[PDB]
């Protein structure tokens, strides 16, 4: 059961200026007090 | 020895506080200087003799 719909609407997306987001953990170690 | 990481030092109860995906923990020099200890959850500072 898998019955698409027409009811679809185009407009071109925002965009969004995404400041300092997006860092993560960059390996599975432990660090503190000190600049890498 | 803590999972193969073979070294000579001194062990100690610590209170660097390892999230819970962390094993290891480094010095400026690239070496292991605390770890957690596998059969029961705690960190370890590891000092040189
Ligand atoms: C649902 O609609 C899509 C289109 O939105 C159908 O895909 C088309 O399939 C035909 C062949 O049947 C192709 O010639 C078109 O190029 C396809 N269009 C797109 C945009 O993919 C799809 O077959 C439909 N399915 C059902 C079950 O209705
Ligand atoms: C080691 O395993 C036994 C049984 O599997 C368990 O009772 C014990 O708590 C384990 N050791 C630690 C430090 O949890």
């Not at chain 1, 609407?9 to 860092?23: D, I």
């Not at chain 1, 599975?28 to 890498?36: A, D, E, G």
């Not at chain 2, 193969?4 to 290891?24: A, C, M, R, W």
């Amino acid at each position: 059961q898998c019955v698409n719909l027409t009811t679809r609407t185009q407009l071109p997306p925002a965009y969004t200026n995404s400041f300092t987001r997006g860092v993560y953990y960059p390996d599975k170690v432990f660090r503190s007090s000190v600049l890498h | 020895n803590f999972n193969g990481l073979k070294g000579t030092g001194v062990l100690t109860e610590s209170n660097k506080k390892f999230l819970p995906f962390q094993q290891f923990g480094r010095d400026i020099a690239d070496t292991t200087d605390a770890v957690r200890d596998p059969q029961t959850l705690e960190i370890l500072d590891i000092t040189p003799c």
